[PDB]
C-alpha cells in the first residue's frame with residue numbers, strides 16, 4: 001500500500017585500494033566523483049585487473065544504495081527507476097547488479113538500453129581518501145516517457161541525487177528527472193534530494209539553492225556539502241539556512257553526529273526532555289520531540305531542530321565510512337513511509353511518523369551499521 | 384571463509400487460489416508436486432492470467448529457497464548451482480528470479496541454458512491444500528561439467544532435494560547431482576538431503592533408504608515424508624530409524640513442533656536441564672544439550688534426541704504454511720556453517736556449533752517467521 005520511489009544512474013561499484021600515483025595517472029582528484037572518458041576507463045580497469053587490485057564488486061549508485069537500504073530496513077517495497085541492459089548475459093555487470101539488489105527493491109520498471117550500465121571505480125588511496133571514477137555507459141539514457149506516472153502517484157516520496165543533472169549534452173536523464181518531479185507535484189508527493197560531494201555543489205551553489213526552492217521538500221547532505229551549498233561552516237546554521245528553501249533537512253556531521261531541522265505547527269510543538277543544547281541557535285533542541293510537517297501544511301510554522309551524537313561513543317573502529325550518510329537518509333525514508341501507511345489506515349498533516357529526536361536516533365543506528373561493513377549497502381536489517 | 388552450497392532446479396513460483404474444478408481440469412492431485420506437459424502448462428497459465436487469479440510471483444525452488452533463507456539469516460555467502468537463461472530480457476521470469484534472490488546468495492555459478500527456467504504453479508485450493516504444478520523448461524539441464532569442484536571443496540555442506548532425481552529420461556541433472564556428491568565425499572563435505580513430498584518418496588522408499596546410506600550425512604523431512612520413508616507414523620521413531628542411515632536428522636511435525644536425532648561421542652554427552660520427556664524412546668531428550676557429531680567421528684557414538692514445541696504456543700494465526708520446514712533447515716545450516724568458521728579460526732570433530740536443543744529452538748523461531756508471511760522466502764532476518 002505504501003512505497004518509496006527513486007531515480008538513479010544504474011551503477012556497479014568496482015572497489016580497489018591504489019597508490020597516489022594511480023590517481024594522478026588517470027586524471028583524478030582525491031575525494032571527488034569525476035566522470036571519465038571511455039578510453040581512460042578501459043586503461044584504468046585493465047590496470048586494476050592486471051595488478052589484481054579489485055577487492056570488491058557490488059551494485060552501487062547513491063539512489064540505488066538508498067532504495068536497497070530502505071527495503072532492507074523496512075522489509076517493504078521500494079521502486080528504482082533507471083536503465084538496465086536489454087540483454088543480460090550471465091556474469092555480466094548487469095547480471096551482478098540484479099543479483100546484488102535487495103529482494104524488495106522493485107526493478108521491473110528499469111528501462112532497457114542497448115549499451116552497458118554505469119561503472120563506478122571506487123578508489124581508496126593510501127591516505128584513506130576515497131575517489132569515484134565514473135564510466136557512465138548508458139546510465140543517463142533514461143527517457144521521460146519511461147517514468148511511470150502511477151508509480152510516483154502512489155509513492156510516499158520521490159528520491160533523487162544531485163548527480164542526476166550531471167550528464168553529457170543532450171542525454172535525457174535530466175529531462176526524465178524533471179518529468180518525475182512534475183508528477184510528484186501533481187500528486188503532492190514530497191521530493192527528496194541528496195547532495196553528491198562538496199566539489200560538485202560548489203560549481204554553482206546558487207543554482208542548487210533555486211532548484212531546492214522550486215522543487216524539493218526534503219534535503220539530505222553532509223556538513224561539507226552543506227557548507228558548499230549555504231556558505232555556513234556550522235552544520236546547525238547551514239541546516240537552518242536551508243530551511244529557507246525546503247521543509248526538512250538532514251545534515252550529517254561525521255564524528256559530531258547529525259542534525260535535523262524542520263517545521264512543526266506551533267500549536268502541536270512538543271518540548272524535549274533532554275538538556276537544552278547550546279549552539280549558534282540557542283536551545284535549538286527545545287522542541288526536539290515535535291514531528292515534522294511541510295511548511296505549506298502549517299498555519300503558524302515553527303522551526304524545530306535536533307542533534308544526536310553518534311551511536312558510537314568514542315573512537316570505535318570504523319571498517320569503511322562509505323555510504324554512512326545515505327544510510328541515515330534511508331532511516332528517514334522509512335519513518336516517512338511509515339507515516340503514509342498510518343495515514344491511509346485511519347487532523348494535522350504530518351511529514352514524519354516520529355519526532356525529529358526519534359528519527360535522529362534511528363538514523364544514527366543505521367549509519368553505525370553501514371560504518372561497520374565495507375559496502376555502502378546493508379544486507380541485513382538492524383538487530 | 385565459510386559457505387554452504389546447494390543444487391536446485393531453477394524455479395519461479397507463480398501462486399494462485401483456485402477451485403477444486405481447476406485442479407481436476409489440469410490433471411493434478413491436491414497436495415502433490417507434479418510435473419506437467421508443456422501444452423497443459425500453457426493452458427493452465429493462460430487461464431490464470433485470463434481470470435486474474437495470480438496473487439504472487441517470486442523466486443522459488445526447495446533449495447533456492449533454503450539458500451536464500453540461509454543467506455538472509457546468516458548474512459553470509461551461499462552458492463546456488465543450477466541453470467539460468469543465457470540471455471535475460473527485462474521483466475522475464477529469469478530477470479525476476481535474479482532480482483528476487485537474496486543479495487548474499489551467489490548466482491555467478493549458474494549454468495547458461497538456451498531455454499526457459501522452471502515455473503512452479505503453486506495452487507491453493509478452497510480447502511487450503513496446496514498443490515505444485517511444475518513446468519520444468521530447461522531446469523534439469525545442469526551438466527556435471529558445470530559443477531565447480533573448488534566451490535564444493537571449501538563448503539561446509541552440500542544441500543540437495545529429492546526432487547533433483549525427478550527429470551525426463553536422459554537429462555543430465557541426476558548425473559550433475561552425483562558429481563557434486565563425488566566431490567563432497569572427496570573433501571569430506573557433509574551432504575544434506577531434504578525430502579520433497581510423501582507421495583514422491585512413497586514411490587520407492589527402499590531406494591531412498593539406500594541412497595541415504597550411501598551418500599547422506601544430514602536428513603531433513605516433515606513427519607509425513609518421514610512416515611513414507613521409514614514406515615513409522617511416530618516422528619521420534621522415524622527419526623531414530625533414519626539414524627541407521629545418516630548422521631543427523633531434522634524431523635518437523637507441524638503443530639507438535641520438531642525433532643532432532645543425532646550422534647555424540649559418549650564421553651562428550653551433555654545432559655539436559657529440561658524435564659525428561661516420555662515417548663516411544665523413554666527419556667529421549669536426556670542428552671539434549673549435546674552437540675552433534677558424524678557417526679564416523681565417534682569412537683563410542685551415543686544416539687541423542689531433542690524435541691521442541693512450536694515457538695507459537697496455542698493456535699496463533701498462520702498466514703501461510705508454505706516453506707516453514709525448509710526454514711528450519713536453513714537454521715540448521717547456519718549452525719553447521721558457524722561451526723566450520725569457528726574450527727578454521729582455532730579435539731572432538733563436531734558437526735554442529737550448538738546443542739541439539741539450541742538448534743531446535745533456533746529452527747522453531749525461523750519456522751514461525753516463515754509461517755507469518757506468504758512467501759517461503761524470508762526477506763529479513765530474525766529480530
Ligand SMILES: Nc1ncnc2c1ncn2[C@@H]1O[C@H](COP(=O)(O)OP(=O)(O)O)[C@@H](O)[C@H]1O
Nearest residue numbers: 222252253254255257258310323324325364367
Ligand atoms: N568518524 C566517525 N565516527 C563516528 N561516527 C561516524 C563517523 N563518521 C560517520 N559517522 C556516523 O555516520 C553518520 C553519517 O556520516 P557522515 O560522514 O556525516 O556522512 P557521509 O557518508 O555523507 O559522509 C554520522 O552522522 C555519524 O553518526
Ligand SMILES: Nc1ncnc2c1ncn2[C@@H]1O[C@H](COP(=O)(O)OP(=O)(O)O)[C@@H](O)[C@H]1O
Nearest residue numbers: 605635636637638640641693706707708747750
Ligand atoms: N499449524 C502449526 N502451528 C504451529 N506451528 C507450526 C504449524 N505448522 C508448522 N509449524 C511450525 O513450522 C515448523 C515446520 O512445519 P512443518 O509443517 O512440519 O514443515 P513443512 O513445511 O515441511 O510441512 C514446525 O516444526 C512448527 O514449528
Ligand SMILES: Nc1nc2c(ncn2[C@@H]2O[C@H](CO)[C@@H](O)[C@H]2O)c(=O)[nH]1
Nearest residue numbers: 009011033060061062120132163323
Ligand atoms: N548516482 C550516482 N552515484 C554516484 C556517482 N558518483 C558516485 N556515486 C555513488 O556514491 C556511492 C557512495 O556514496 C557509491 O556507491 C557510488 O556508486 C554518480 O555520478 N552518480
Ligand SMILES: Nc1nc2c(ncn2[C@@H]2O[C@H](CO)[C@@H](O)[C@H]2O)c(=O)[nH]1
Nearest residue numbers: 213242243244245246247248295296
Ligand atoms: N521552506 C520554506 N518555504 C517558505 C518559507 N517562507 C515562505 N515559504 C514558502 O515559499 C514560497 C515563497 O513565498 C511560498 O509558497 C511560501 O509559503 C520558509 O521559511 N521556508
Ligand SMILES: Nc1nc2c(ncn2[C@@H]2O[C@H](CO)[C@@H](O)[C@H]2O)c(=O)[nH]1
Nearest residue numbers: 392394416443444445503515546706
Ligand atoms: N526443486 C524443486 N522444488 C520444488 C518442486 N516442486 C515444488 N518445489 C518447491 O517447493 C517449495 C515449497 O516448499 C516451492 O517454492 C516450490 O517451488 C520440484 O519439482 N523441484
Ligand SMILES: Nc1nc2c(ncn2[C@@H]2O[C@H](CO)[C@@H](O)[C@H]2O)c(=O)[nH]1
Nearest residue numbers: 596625626627628629630631678679
Ligand atoms: N549413520 C549410521 N552409520 C552407521 C551405523 N552403524 C554403522 N554405521 C556405519 O555404516 C557403515 C556400515 O557398516 C560403516 O561405515 C559404519 O561405520 C549407524 O547406526 N548409523
Ligand SMILES: [K+]
Nearest residue numbers: 195196197222
Ligand atoms: K552526500
Ligand SMILES: [K+]
Nearest residue numbers: 320373374375
Ligand atoms: K561502509
Ligand SMILES: [K+]
Nearest residue numbers: 099101482484
Ligand atoms: K537480488
Ligand SMILES: [K+]
Nearest residue numbers: 578579580605
Ligand atoms: K519436505
Ligand SMILES: [K+]
Nearest residue numbers: 703756757758
Ligand atoms: K509462508
Ligand SMILES: [Mg+2]
Nearest residue numbers: 222254321324
Ligand atoms: Mg563521511
Ligand SMILES: [Mg+2]
Nearest residue numbers: 605637704707
Ligand atoms: Mg506443513
